[PDB]
Amino acid sequence: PGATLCLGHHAVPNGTIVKTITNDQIEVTNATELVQNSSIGEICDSPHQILDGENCTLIDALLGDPQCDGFQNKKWDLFVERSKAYSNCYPYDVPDYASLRSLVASSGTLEFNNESFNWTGVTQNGTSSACIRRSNNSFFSRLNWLTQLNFKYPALNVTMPNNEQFDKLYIWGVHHPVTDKDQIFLYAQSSGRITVSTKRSQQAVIPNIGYRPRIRNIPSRISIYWTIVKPGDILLINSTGNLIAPRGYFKIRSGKSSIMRSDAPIGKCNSECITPNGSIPNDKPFQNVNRITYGACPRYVKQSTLKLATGMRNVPE
Amino acid sequence: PGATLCLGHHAVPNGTIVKTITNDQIEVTNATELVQNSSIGEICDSPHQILDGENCTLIDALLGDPQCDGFQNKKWDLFVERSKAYSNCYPYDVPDYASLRSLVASSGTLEFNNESFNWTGVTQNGTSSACIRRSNNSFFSRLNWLTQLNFKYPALNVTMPNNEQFDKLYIWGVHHPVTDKDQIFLYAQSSGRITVSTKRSQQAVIPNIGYRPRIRNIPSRISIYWTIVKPGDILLINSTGNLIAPRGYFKIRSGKSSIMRSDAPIGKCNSECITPNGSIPNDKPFQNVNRITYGACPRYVKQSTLKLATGMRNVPE
Amino acid sequence: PGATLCLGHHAVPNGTIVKTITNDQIEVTNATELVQNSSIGEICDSPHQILDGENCTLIDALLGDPQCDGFQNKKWDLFVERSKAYSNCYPYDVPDYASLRSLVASSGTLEFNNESFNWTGVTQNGTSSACIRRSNNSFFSRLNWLTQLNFKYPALNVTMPNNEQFDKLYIWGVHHPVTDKDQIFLYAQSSGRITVSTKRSQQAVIPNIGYRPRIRNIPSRISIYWTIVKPGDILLINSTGNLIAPRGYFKIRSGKSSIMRSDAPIGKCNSECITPNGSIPNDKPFQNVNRITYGACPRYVKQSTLKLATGMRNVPE
Amino acid sequence: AIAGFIENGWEGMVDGWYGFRHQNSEGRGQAADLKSTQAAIDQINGKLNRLIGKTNEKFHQIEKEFSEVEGRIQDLEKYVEDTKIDLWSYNAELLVALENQHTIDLTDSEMNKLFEKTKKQLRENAEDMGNGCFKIYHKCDNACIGSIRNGTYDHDVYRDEALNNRFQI
Amino acid sequence: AIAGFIENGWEGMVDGWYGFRHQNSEGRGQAADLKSTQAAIDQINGKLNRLIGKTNEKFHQIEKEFSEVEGRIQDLEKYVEDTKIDLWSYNAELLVALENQHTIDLTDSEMNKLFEKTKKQLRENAEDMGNGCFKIYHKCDNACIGSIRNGTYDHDVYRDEALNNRFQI
Amino acid sequence: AIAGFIENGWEGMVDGWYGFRHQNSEGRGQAADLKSTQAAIDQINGKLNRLIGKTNEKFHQIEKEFSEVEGRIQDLEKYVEDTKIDLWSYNAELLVALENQHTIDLTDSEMNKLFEKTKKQLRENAEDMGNGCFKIYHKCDNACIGSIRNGTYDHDVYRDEALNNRFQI
């Protein structure tokens, strides 16, 4: 009679379908998912330093909008801007807003050092009902609204050397009065001019008088500019009117910092990978949660699922 | 004696050469081409909505060049601009022409709604011999050339609220007179200014007086600008001269529309994939016809041919 | 007894580790490196035409800085700019410096043709102590500093047609005087204006009077602009003061030319692939020397080593 | 004499991709094996269905040809497009090389599978000649050959005859 | 009757991926082969370790959503991102297809290796039934079957008995 | 005793990649097989020729290092380059892994092909010892061994002797 000896392999009743080169669908004994498709719906506060902008855009925290005073000098790995954020100070715009926002975000610090600019012969610390701070008329914390004194506005020609070992970022602006009358009432003379220069740059701005739609009852505007001053260089401000002067400089750092638009709440938890939807686990190589990411993250793909076989072909009995 | 039984496979007299990992060239029994290398030399009018620009650029159709009156309010999936197209109205330029062209192309509509701007105290509907419509001096259909009335040009300060559920695109401009004389003759005063603003934007333009080379006997120029007004916002035009005023707004849509430069004729036929050379079949995964495509198209590659084996190794007898 | 016959393969005592799909590490008998990780530390002068900028940036060679006179009319495949390069003429800036640098670099020629512009009623060939040439006050070789004559600056309105078969590149500028006094002393009248146009373009510039920090004892500045004139078009310069006039045009070519920032010395040798570190061998498909390359080069990757097996699995005895 | 798949194919087999040739006491013939043929064809159709008629819609993109020199922005637009085209060209080249490798492997595999299957039917009753052919050591008429081709051959029926033939001196 | 790996798997083998079933004069049974099982598992763990927990840090990038229409620069930012996502999506699709092919090949390979190893122990003493099973032509009790499973089976011990059984009429 | 390719290579075979060791009544020796050796080498040279000396010319591109902070445009230039480098780095990693897999497979394949070819020459006259070696059951002197290595061995010459040896008790 003898014996019979048969070689075989296992099989399972509940197999899973995968794709190979040979087959669009083949059942295997087991598989694992390579596409992360869910977030936990909150941005974990660890291990990255999160700064929740709350009602403040980064630019409003920079200029010093009154509701953003709590942000002075803070640092971040990720600044989170909320869709509800709104400005509540003198109405302004920033030509190339997106670039100023990007470079501050990437710098990752609001550290500000005050400097003593020699502003002789003008009225300082101008304020407005459009920018209320603790019940009083006020202004952007980091800017100095200069106007005429004793019906005169003597031409400004002020220098600030950078004798530090780091770059200085200066934020300044131009007031665009609503009428030719207001130009006179504020600055003495019928047309202002601003020239801000260094050894390696110059920026020249002329105000544009006129009506804009009222924002917090103000039909005029401020336009914001910026200037970087390297070590051994000099800021030179030369102006016959309309200057919204800097009070000092922001430190500008380089590193890994960024900014993200999200309405997800901040949670007390620890997760490497952040998306606008919330933190996501980063065990899988791919993800279809969001193309916007910060940190050690799976790569964004369009597939909602990719199954990697972790067992042999399943051939039920 | 017994029998002999031999196992074998087919072979063909006319094999084809393919590339594998193992071999740079191996003959197989059959192969198919994966690179589409030809067009039918015409752009099929189906299934995409084609708008043939003929003598008109999209921007000339937008502004309302007299030869483009037939285009009013039309929509497209693909606007086709011809190399022969030429302007035939007041000579103009568009700072960031490429962006205005892109955003209208992508919007995919020339739908225009007239509005009643309160232009009191000026002469309206200015025209020129540079822009002939049905034998008479004329102007861009969608723009209103305003000039002095009774030797006066009273400052304009006109509002247009957007109370719609969609965005409004306004096209307007500035006339740059040839001489200081003409500045006076047209606008009363020696220097014009234009300020166009919303709650979220402002644009200020000063004309630049001077000679440019004559185009249709005109040595002056118009420069074109645009402004988007969102729902609940307001257009505010404030000007002391030189304004080329809007007559209304274009609807701005989002969707799948585009623009393509081509001289291929439009044909009565049906093809998904369009290139500048003409429509191409889209059965193959790749193509080397043109890097510029619209629709469901094979991907552009540099190879002129890629052969996929569809049979076994060919080993003749 | 019979015989025994065994099949086998070779093995080596010194195998090398490679990666496969099956194994993260497997020892094979031999392998070769696919990532080029070294340069020879010099840029070989063959087979590409190298132009060593030495103390000159490309833009300074273009404008005609006195130390760059040796560069007149030269061509290159690769212009090499040195980190030590410095300007030594009238202090200037170029709005969109990066674009002018790119387009000249890509053109690959400094060929310049002088033209006779009709400059009647002004003083020509203005010079400065900021720009010394052979011990005398001088100026940029390719620019003509025009000023008042007999206390007058009669408005300029000068034409230059392009009747050639190629494009002309014109470099010109605007002088920004330090004070309103100097505006008068140089140009007769309290405000200059420049309009440079063709049939297809216009550029309008107003000088901005003011103090900038001193460079070679000069607190004023020149700002540089450029204009391309196609065949059958016309350059039209219309100016009431402050024009730094062109002396002619640069030829503008298309081809394979570029510019590279490097401090590597130029060597007498022959190598196809250039990086800022020096020439690299191009036998391997990849390299991790520099992401910046010119010529027939391996592709930049992040890996420092990739070993391709060139023998079988190594199984010692 | 007839010869197997090692060293050549059969231009005369027009009704199948794989098959059998025989010589016995009733003559010489050829027959296609439809199962192995179909197995190869189905796999190749599988590939084709993944690669053919599967294009991707794109709409408004960036400009890719330029009438004027501009510098920085145009340099970037051009570099983005060149970058993209080179990466797709690489993907296409690799994909076709890998696909074609796999096609040659799967078609070689069906030949080997058919040979092995035949070897395992015959067992004991035949010798592998090393050239894709078996020498069968018993009378094997057309019905017998057919039974091997159809997988209904019972080696036990012929074993006595076959062994007697093989192991006689 | 018991049957091998050609045509089905064994849902009842829960303690291994590959193994043996036998019938002899002491009964019928099953035993997992741990070496072949482990060889497959180790390879699959090898893949997993390359793909899982290996993400790449990125920090400040470009914007990818836009509240206003802008034209040229925004067209480029969007096209760059779309381009990138399509290329990664392709890489992911191909990678999984190739990995899964290789997994099926390596797991099939361990089955074939175990079968061949068994065939080469038995040699002369057994016949390949063509279905993953061997008919062993000598008495082979549980210890004998065990010796085959453990690689300690000496075909010389049974050769006389086995040949006597096979080559009798 | 001499041993085959299963479980180790031969450091003493310096004149070929694949070959034969024998023991007979004239002694013990080794000989390289040049055909199998050359088949592996040619394939590997084939790969090398596709990957070596095949670089691609590029000329004016985008800037990739920046002396000043600029924001949006620079963010984009940087992201485009980072994107490109990561995609090429991935292509390089995959390519080398796939190439190296294929090299190991093709070199293993030539070993298996040589073994099978030898098995099919010997047939009936030898037994596969399961370790890459055959026990040949007839006197096989140096000329005989040579005839196996050269593919001119006729098993019929020795069959009577060989069977007489194998199937005696």
Ligand SMILES: *[C@@H]1O[C@H](CO)[C@@H](O[C@@H]2O[C@H](CO)[C@@H](O[C@@H]3O[C@H](CO[C@H]4O[C@H](CO)[C@@H](O)[C@H](O)[C@@H]4O)[C@@H](O)[C@H](O[C@H]4O[C@H](CO)[C@@H](O)[C@H](O)[C@@H]4O)[C@@H]3O)[C@H](O)[C@H]2NC(C)=O)[C@H](O)[C@H]1NC(C)=O
């Ligand atoms: C050039 O064109 C622009 C655009 O139209 C004109 O700008 C308008 O100017 C008028 C007059 O200065 C502005 O009207 C004022 O609005 C203020 C803000 O009101 C807000 O809150 C109320 C709720 O009570 C809302 O209804 C309203 O929508 C606003 O959100 C008021 O504070 C002002 O009130 C004054 O007048 C009323 C009576 O009319 C009195 O009862 C008050 O006590 C007070 O004296 C006033 O109503 C209007 O807002 C401006 N529009 C825009 C879009 O900015 C320029 O005036 C015009 N220039 C010239 C020179 O003509």
Ligand SMILES: *[C@@H]1O[C@H](CO)[C@@H](O[C@@H]2O[C@H](CO)[C@@H](O[C@@H]3O[C@H](CO[C@H]4O[C@H](CO)[C@@H](O)[C@H](O)[C@@H]4O)[C@@H](O)[C@H](O[C@H]4O[C@H](CO)[C@@H](O)[C@H](O)[C@@H]4O)[C@@H]3O)[C@H](O)[C@H]2NC(C)=O)[C@H](O)[C@H]1NC(C)=O
């Ligand atoms: C500042 O510098 C600019 C640049 O040179 C000057 O611009 C030129 O101005 C002159 C005079 O106004 C222009 O000349 C005029 O050209 C008109 C168009 O002619 C076209 O068609 C004819 C065919 O007949 C072609 O030959 C020609 O090339 C054009 O395509 C004519 O209609 C005008 O004709 C008048 O003069 C002639 C006699 O000269 C009479 O017969 C006519 O009846 C009529 O009165 C005239 O010829 C010239 O085109 C301008 N050039 C450019 C490039 O624009 C500015 O004048 C100058 N400013 C100052 C203040 O000096």
Ligand SMILES: *[C@@H]1O[C@H](CO)[C@@H](O[C@@H]2O[C@H](CO)[C@@H](O[C@@H]3O[C@H](CO[C@H]4O[C@H](CO)[C@@H](O)[C@H](O)[C@@H]4O)[C@@H](O)[C@H](O[C@H]4O[C@H](CO)[C@@H](O)[C@H](O)[C@@H]4O)[C@@H]3O)[C@H](O)[C@H]2NC(C)=O)[C@H](O)[C@H]1NC(C)=O
């Ligand atoms: C608006 O604000 C700006 C910014 O401060 C002022 O610009 C300064 O103007 C002053 C006066 O014109 C400049 O001072 C001059 O510097 C020249 C260059 O000196 C260089 O070399 C010396 C070595 O000897 C270095 O120490 C120095 O750092 C420079 O590198 C000198 O040549 C001038 O010398 C004159 O004065 C001295 C005595 O003070 C005499 O001994 C000399 O003979 C000679 O007469 C002078 O020192 C200064 O450089 C400017 N600063 C900048 C940053 O540009 C504007 O003046 C101001 N405008 C108004 C209207 O007030």
Ligand SMILES: CC(=O)N[C@H]1[C@H](O[C@@H]2[C@@H](O)[C@H](O)O[C@H](CO)[C@@H]2O)O[C@H](CO)[C@@H](O[C@@H]2O[C@H](CO)[C@H](O)[C@H](O[C@]3(C(=O)O)C[C@H](O)[C@@H](NC(C)=O)[C@H]([C@H](O)[C@H](O)CO)O3)[C@H]2O)[C@@H]1O
């Ligand atoms: C009806 C109207 O338009 N009235 C405004 C006035 O216009 C006159 C018209 O009434 C009249 O019909 O026609 C006249 C011509 O013949 C006039 O055009 O113009 C003044 C401005 O000059 C308006 O007053 C302003 O109203 C503000 C309300 O939002 C506010 O009260 C302004 O005061 C502040 C402020 O808080 O914003 C006071 C600040 O201390 C001051 N700061 C500084 C540093 O000077 C600012 C600042 O001057 C402005 O913000 C600059 O734009 O103003 C008040 O001046 C009047 O409503």
Ligand SMILES: CC(=O)N[C@H]1[C@H](O[C@@H]2[C@@H](O)[C@H](O)O[C@H](CO)[C@@H]2O)O[C@H](CO)[C@@H](O[C@@H]2O[C@H](CO)[C@H](O)[C@H](O[C@]3(C(=O)O)C[C@H](O)[C@@H](NC(C)=O)[C@H]([C@H](O)[C@H](O)CO)O3)[C@H]2O)[C@@H]1O
């Ligand atoms: C020789 C010459 O340059 N002549 C032009 C004249 O210049 C004078 C010189 O002749 C003389 O040597 O020196 C003088 C100084 O002492 C003068 O500079 O300047 C006038 C313009 O003021 C020229 O006349 C214009 O010629 C056009 C021919 O292409 C055309 O006929 C102009 O009329 C229209 C037009 O159709 O374009 C008439 C339109 O109704 C009018 N529209 C409006 C809304 O006002 C336009 C518009 O005024 C201009 O297009 C604005 O740039 O003009 C005609 O004014 C003369 O040739």
Ligand SMILES: CC(=O)N[C@H]1[C@H](O[C@@H]2[C@@H](O)[C@H](O)O[C@H](CO)[C@@H]2O)O[C@H](CO)[C@@H](O[C@@H]2O[C@H](CO)[C@H](O)[C@H](O[C@]3(C(=O)O)C[C@H](O)[C@@H](NC(C)=O)[C@H]([C@H](O)[C@H](O)CO)O3)[C@H]2O)[C@@H]1O
């Ligand atoms: C102390 C001072 O600032 N002095 C400068 C003078 O300012 C006066 C002050 O001293 C005084 O305290 O207050 C006064 C007001 O009441 C004055 O503001 O201004 C003059 C310029 O007008 C300065 O002289 C210039 O110094 C230069 C030294 O770097 C140089 O010598 C200038 O001459 C050239 C030059 O080489 O750069 C001579 C060239 O031939 C000339 N070229 C042309 C084509 O005209 C140039 C050119 O005029 C300027 O470069 C234009 O910016 O100037 C010399 O004019 C004095 O130091």
Ligand SMILES: *[C@@H]1O[C@H](CO)[C@@H](O[C@@H]2O[C@H](CO)[C@@H](O[C@@H]3O[C@H](CO)[C@@H](O)[C@H](O[C@H]4O[C@H](CO)[C@@H](O)[C@H](O)[C@@H]4O)[C@@H]3O)[C@H](O)[C@H]2NC(C)=O)[C@H](O)[C@H]1NC(C)=O
């Ligand atoms: C950069 O800074 C410098 C230095 O501060 C600055 O120069 C200054 O310019 C002002 C304004 O032009 C000068 O003051 C004027 O001097 C001229 C000289 O003739 C006069 O015409 C002016 O008189 C008018 O304005 C007076 C104002 O009250 C009226 O009283 C008079 O009736 C006239 O309307 C006026 O006095 C000043 O002298 C210089 N300062 C020095 C030290 O030279 C320059 O303007 C600044 N540049 C910019 C771009 O801001």
Ligand SMILES: *[C@@H]1O[C@H](CO)[C@@H](O[C@@H]2O[C@H](CO)[C@@H](O[C@@H]3O[C@H](CO)[C@@H](O)[C@H](O[C@H]4O[C@H](CO)[C@@H](O)[C@H](O)[C@@H]4O)[C@@H]3O)[C@H](O)[C@H]2NC(C)=O)[C@H](O)[C@H]1NC(C)=O
């Ligand atoms: C935005 O719109 C507002 C509202 O329309 C507008 O304000 C207006 O400005 C004009 C021009 O400046 C004003 O008219 C002037 O009033 C001043 C007041 O002193 C006078 O100096 C002017 O006189 C000169 O011009 C007259 C023209 O005929 C001559 O007769 C005289 O001899 C002088 O040369 C002139 O009368 C007008 O009063 C205001 N309107 C109101 C309601 O306040 C503003 O200009 C616009 N802004 C822009 C940027 O367009």
Ligand SMILES: *[C@@H]1O[C@H](CO)[C@@H](O[C@@H]2O[C@H](CO)[C@@H](O[C@@H]3O[C@H](CO)[C@@H](O)[C@H](O[C@H]4O[C@H](CO)[C@@H](O)[C@H](O)[C@@H]4O)[C@@H]3O)[C@H](O)[C@H]2NC(C)=O)[C@H](O)[C@H]1NC(C)=O
């Ligand atoms: C482009 O080129 C054209 C042609 O050259 C040019 O036109 C010229 O403009 C100048 C400056 O405006 C004109 O000269 C003026 O003519 C007017 C006419 O009323 C006068 O008001 C001016 O007088 C003042 O300046 C004189 C200078 O000495 C003083 O003596 C006098 O007291 C006044 O202060 C002055 O005479 C000139 O007539 C025209 N030329 C022609 C042929 O028409 C235009 O300016 C240029 N455009 C640009 C943007 O540069």
Ligand SMILES: *[C@@H]1O[C@H](CO)[C@@H](O[C@@H]2O[C@H](CO)[C@@H](O)[C@H](O)[C@H]2NC(C)=O)[C@H](O)[C@H]1NC(C)=O
């Ligand atoms: C489709 O059109 C493109 C663009 O016009 C053609 O490519 C050009 O071909 C001409 C003539 O050979 C060359 O001089 C240009 O350099 C090419 N341009 C580019 C951008 O590559 C292409 O040949 C056409 N293809 C077909 C199939 O008609």
Ligand SMILES: *[C@@H]1O[C@H](CO)[C@@H](O)[C@H](O)[C@H]1NC(C)=O
């Ligand atoms: C071979 O020839 C036949 C008949 O002419 C043709 O139909 C077939 O397509 C050819 N095949 C190849 C691969 O060339």
Ligand SMILES: *[C@@H]1O[C@H](CO)[C@@H](O)[C@H](O)[C@H]1NC(C)=O
């Ligand atoms: C084999 O199958 C074919 C099918 O056409 C049939 O003609 C033949 O008689 C069959 N022979 C046997 C022995 O099953």
Ligand SMILES: *[C@@H]1O[C@H](CO)[C@@H](O)[C@H](O)[C@H]1NC(C)=O
């Ligand atoms: C085989 O190994 C197993 C290990 O559990 C052991 O129980 C059995 O007795 C062994 N048999 C032989 C013959 O080696």
Ligand SMILES: *[C@@H]1O[C@H](CO)[C@@H](O)[C@H](O)[C@H]1NC(C)=O
């Ligand atoms: C085998 O070939 C070798 C070639 O060197 C030769 O020396 C040897 O004699 C040959 N033997 C036979 C039996 O063909």
